[PDB]
């Protein structure tokens, strides 16, 4: 099979599945509705590996008994009106320790996604994250569940 499976639901709506990294990201250019080019998709991939780096930084959860916390990309919104800008959507899954995890994840994402700085694709990136709480040992749980992408699909 292929490592990455992209698909166009709409000119401004792209679904990207990464089998090797076990990730799923939604590429959307909402502000303008412009068609996602090769550069836009490549930018999205660069953001996935960035957050992937943030995940392993907070702890290797690829091993058995992943205590967490889980940090995964949900969607990538591109502003294409005047200046090239990208808004990344991230979900943090995990009271004092929760605040510490949120702080570490926030700082890691700023460095990984190059927030407020010009990216390799000449892009100014920013991110928004939501906090979720679920049993890590639960059978009905996954970093990239269906309901998690309900906001962007």
């Amino acid at each position: 099979m292929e490592s990455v499976n992209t698909s166009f639901l709409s000119p401004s709506l792209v679904t990207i599945r990464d089998f090797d990294n076990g990730q799923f990201a939604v590429l959307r250019i909402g502000r303008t509705g412009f068609p996602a080019d090769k550069g836009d998709i490549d930018l999205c991939l660069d953001k996935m590996i960035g957050v992937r780096a943030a995940q392993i930084f907070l702890g290797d959860d690829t091993e058995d008994g992943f205590k967490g916390p889980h940090i995964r990309i949900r969607c990538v919104d591109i502003d294409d009106k005047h200046t090239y800008n990208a808004m990344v959507y991230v979900d943090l899954i995990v009271e004092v320790e929760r605040e510490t995890a949120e702080e570490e994840a926030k700082l890691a994402l700023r460095v990984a996604l190059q927030v407020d700085i010009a990216d390799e694709h000449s892009c100014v990136t920013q991110f928004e994250m939501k906090l979720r709480e679920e049993l890590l040992s639960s059978d009905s749980f996954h970093p990239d569940k269906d309901e998690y992408y309900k906001d962007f699909l």
Binding site: I49, F57, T62, L107
Partner: protein
Amino acid sequence: MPVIQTFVSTPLDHHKRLLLAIIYRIVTRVVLGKPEDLVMMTFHDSTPMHFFGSTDPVACVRVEALGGYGPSEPEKVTSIVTAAITAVCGIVADRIFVLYFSPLHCGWNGTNF
């Protein structure tokens, strides 16, 4: 201006080296408290190494930062780097060395700091 050398016995491609690169950037900014654009990283893959009586997959990381290190920083850096090499390269924790050094002088852009 920190410098991070990564010696590994396993081959490294674009994906692995890029991953370790971003990791070192986050470690530099969050833990070391230094700009992630000012850290230099070198990668030496497929390096003939010998440790614990075997030529099994083994990694050696060199960390060099002027001005020394913080109190609880080396413990944090070692933990993250080891975990980074473990997940990315597949090298076990018991075969990863992380050494820390401090240069007398460091130069950049033709001038010292």
